[PDB]
């Protein structure tokens, strides 16, 4: 059986791992058009703040290691096209120019996403940077110590935007963050969490310019101004972190795509064409909070999907169990995490929800180590089933979001969580811990 896997990032890497322990026998070929196998873009923040010195160590596999295992790795080799009927791909060696056609029995593709750019006048004067992959990591690092860079503008206040904003603010620059939405991180967190994080960011001289539409970049040769409908901001560097678009235009006509470019797949990772599976940022995933499919471009999703595509390689035998959209991040002193439905997700999906927010010290009164924690529990008004949660504190309480993710998946209710057995010891929590306390509040509100 010869299996060709496209992509060395998180979806293609786990497909090779599951092929190694489920079909040890197979002939596996692993292709990467880039020069570096399995660079972890997720570690970009740790590197930019100097926690990690070596950019080449921010990775989880090397080609040499996979080759010890019998996989054939082809870096600097691009898959140009798929011929689904004749079970062939045409590959181009990017260092010599040599094209060749390679045959396969099964193809798993994890082509990923690419940074979306604003296509406006000024579109590319120099020093308008993107944030994905090794090369942009190195270039962004160089600008961190550049004495000529004083004003940084980042466009987009979602996860990548707020990570570029914190790394440049910590390096000493003046940062302005621009978004069309009205709250930084609104996609992930609700108003009661983002009001506290706006304060923290402004305390570290980050200006949040929300509710603004960038119209053009101005400058001679390199960027100098970012002008929006309401304002112009001086900029020596712009980082554009406005979201991701699927890397699938080369597949138009070959595989069925949704209108937005995402690949159509079913719950066994099968595409519209026999023997080719698709995984990762370029696909939709079963979203259990709302029993629908959603694009949730996260590494955890891509890794799980990549393994489930190998499970259904020969027979659709194992449907994907679905995910709740869990994500977390530290912004300056705050460590937060959310899962399931928040206000922006419920609006998008037309889901009506109820919520309680509890803000109080997570340790008992006499304990001097006590700090505030914010916990919001979102539930269904009819069944009172758990639909999502958001938590934040300067203490790390984020592993608790993992218990809520299981509670959404098992369809538990506010009453289940009000009395669920979570340990008490006064150096770690209160006798009704953070999940128990918010669920007890929801029970009273529905009494």
Ligand X SMILES: Cc1cc2nc3c(=O)[nH]c(=O)nc-3n(C[C@H](O)[C@H](O)[C@H](O)COP(=O)(O)OP(=O)(O)OC[C@H]3O[C@@H](n4cnc5c(N)ncnc54)[C@H](O)[C@@H]3O)c2cc1C
Closest CA to 104 of 302, 313, 307, 281: 313
Q: How far is the CB of 38 from ligand X (least distance, A)?
A: 8
Find which of ligand X, ligand NAD, none residue 34 binds, CB within 5 to 8 Å per kind.
Answer: ligand X
Q: 247 contacts which partner out of ligand X, ligand NAD, none, CB within 5 to 8 A by kind?
A: ligand X
113 binds ligand X (CB under 6 A): yes
Catalytic status, residue 23: no
74 vs 129, which CB is nearer to ligand NAD?
129
79 binds ligand X (CB under 6 A): yes
Q: Which is nearer to ligand NAD, 223 or 417 (CB)?
A: 223
- Are 231 and 210 contacting, i.e. CB atoms less than 8 angstroms apart? no
Q: Which 3 state secondary structure label does DSSP give 112?
A: coil
* Residue 44 touching ligand X (CB under 6 A): yes
Site string for ligand X, 297-316 (x = CB under 6 A): xxxx-x--------------
Q: Which stretch binds ligand X (CB under 6 A): 3-11, 187-195, 398-406, 426-434?
A: 3-11
Cβ-proximal residues to 46 (8 Å cutoff; 6+ apart), any chain: 52, 58
Rg (Cα) of the chain, in Å, rounded? Answer: 23
Facing residues of 6 across strands?
Answer: 31, 109
259 labeled binding residue: no
> Does residue 434 contact residue 372 with C-beta atoms inside 8 Å?
no
Distance set, CA 400 to CA 61, 393, 395 (Å)? 30, 12, 12
Rounded Cα distance between 25 and 142, Å, is 45
Q: Which does 157 bind (CB under 5 to 8 A by kind): ligand X, ligand NAD, none?
A: ligand NAD
- Residue for token pair 């060395």: 8
361 annotated ligand binder: no
- The helix or strand, by DSSP H or E, that contains position 134, with its residue range, turns out to be helix 133-144
Largest CA distance in the chain: 72
The annotation status of 96 as a binding-site residue, yes or no, is: no
SS3 335: strand
In terms of phi and psi (left: phi > 0; alpha: psi -120 to 50; beta: otherwise), the region of 402 is alpha
Nearer to ligand X, 78 or 343 (CB): 78
Q: Give the one entry of ligand NAD, ligand X, none that residue 180 binds, where binding means its C-beta sits below a cut-off of 5 to 8 angstroms depending on kind.
A: ligand NAD
Site string for ligand X, 222-261 (x = CB under 6 A): -------------------------x--------------
- CB nearer to ligand NAD: give 108 or 189: 189
Angle at 9 between CA 8 and CA 10, to 5 degrees: 125
* Count of residues of this chain found to bind ligand X when the rule CB under 6 A is applied: 31
Nearer to ligand X, 112 or 156 (CB): 112
Sites of contact with ligand NAD (CB under 6 A): 118, 155-161, 178-181, 187, 214, 241-244, 297-298, 327, 329
Alpha carbons 238 and 246: distance in angstroms, whole number: 23
CB nearer to ligand X: pick between 129 and 379: 129
Which tokens in the block code for residue 234?
């001086």
Candidate ranges 38-46, 144-152, 224-232, 379-387; the one touching ligand X (CB under 6 A):
38-46
Binds 137: which of ligand X, ligand NAD, none (CB < 5-8 Å by kind) = none
190 touches which of ligand X, ligand NAD, none (CB within 5 to 8 A by kind)?
none
Question: And the tokens for 129?
Answer: 């940077």
Question: How far is Cα 158 from Cα 48, in angstroms, rounded to an integer?
Answer: 18
Q: What are the catalytic residues?
A: 10, 42
Binding positions for ligand X, rule: CB under 6 A: 6-12, 31-34, 41-42, 44, 78-79, 110-113, 131-132, 160, 247, 280-281, 297-300, 302
């Amino acid at each position: 059986m010869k299996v060709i896997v496209l992509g060395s990032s998180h979806g293609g890497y786990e497909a090779v791992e599951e092929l190694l322990n489920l079909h040890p026998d197979a002939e596996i070929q692993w292709y990467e058009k880039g020069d570096f196998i399995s660079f972890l873009s997720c570690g970009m923040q740790l590197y930019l703040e100097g926690k990690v010195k070596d950019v080449n160590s921010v990775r989880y596999m090397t080609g040499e290691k996979m080759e010890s295992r019998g996989v054939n790795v082809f870096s600097n080799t691009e898959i140009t096209a798929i011929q689904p009927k004749e079970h062939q791909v045409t590959v181009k060696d990017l260092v010599s120019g040599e094209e060749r056609v390679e045959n396969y029995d099964k193809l798993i593709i994890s082509p990923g996403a690419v940074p979306f750019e604003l296509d406006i006048p000024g579109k590319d004067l120099d020093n308008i940077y993107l944030m994905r992959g090794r090369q942009w990591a190195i270039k962004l690092k160089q600008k961190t110590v550049d004495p000529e860079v004083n004003n940084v503008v980042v466009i987009g206040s979602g996860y990548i935007g707020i990570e570029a904003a914190e790394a440049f603010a910590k390096a000493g620059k003046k940062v302005t963050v621009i978004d069309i939405l009205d709250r930084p991180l609104g996609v992930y967190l609700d108003k009661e969490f983002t009001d506290v994080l706006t304060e923290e960011m402004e305390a570290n001289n980050i200006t949040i310019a929300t509710g603004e539409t960038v119209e053009r970049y101005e400058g001679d040769g390199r960027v100098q101004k970012v002008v929006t409908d309401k304002n112009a901001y001086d900029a020596d560097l712009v980082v554009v972190a406005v979201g991701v678009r699927p890397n699938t235009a080369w597949l138009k006509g070959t595989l069925e795509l949704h209108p937005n470019g995402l690949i159509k797949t079913d719950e066994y990772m099968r595409t519209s064409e026999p023997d080719v599976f698709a995984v990762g940022d370029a696909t939709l995933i079963k979203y259990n909070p709302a029993d629908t499919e959603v694009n949730i471009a996260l590494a955890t999703n891509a890794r799980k999907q990549g393994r489930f595509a190998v499970k259904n390689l020969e027979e659709p035998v194992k449907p994907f169990p679905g995910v709740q959209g869990s994500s977390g991040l530290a912004v300056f002193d705050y460590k937060f995490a959310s899962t399931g439905i928040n206000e922006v997700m419920a609006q998008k999906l037309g889901k009506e929800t109820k919520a309680v927010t509890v803000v109080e010290d997570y340790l008992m009164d006499f304990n001097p180590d006590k700090q505030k924690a914010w916990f919001k529990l979102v539930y269904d008004p009819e069944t009172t089933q758990i639909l999502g949660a958001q938590l934040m504190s300067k203490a790390d309480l984020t592993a608790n979001i993992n218990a809520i993710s299981l509670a959404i998946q098992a369809k538990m209710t506010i009453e289940d969580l009000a009395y669920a057995d979570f340990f008490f010891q006064p150096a770690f929590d209160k006798p009704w811990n953070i999940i128990n306390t918010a669920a007890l509040e929801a029970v009273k509100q529905e009494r």
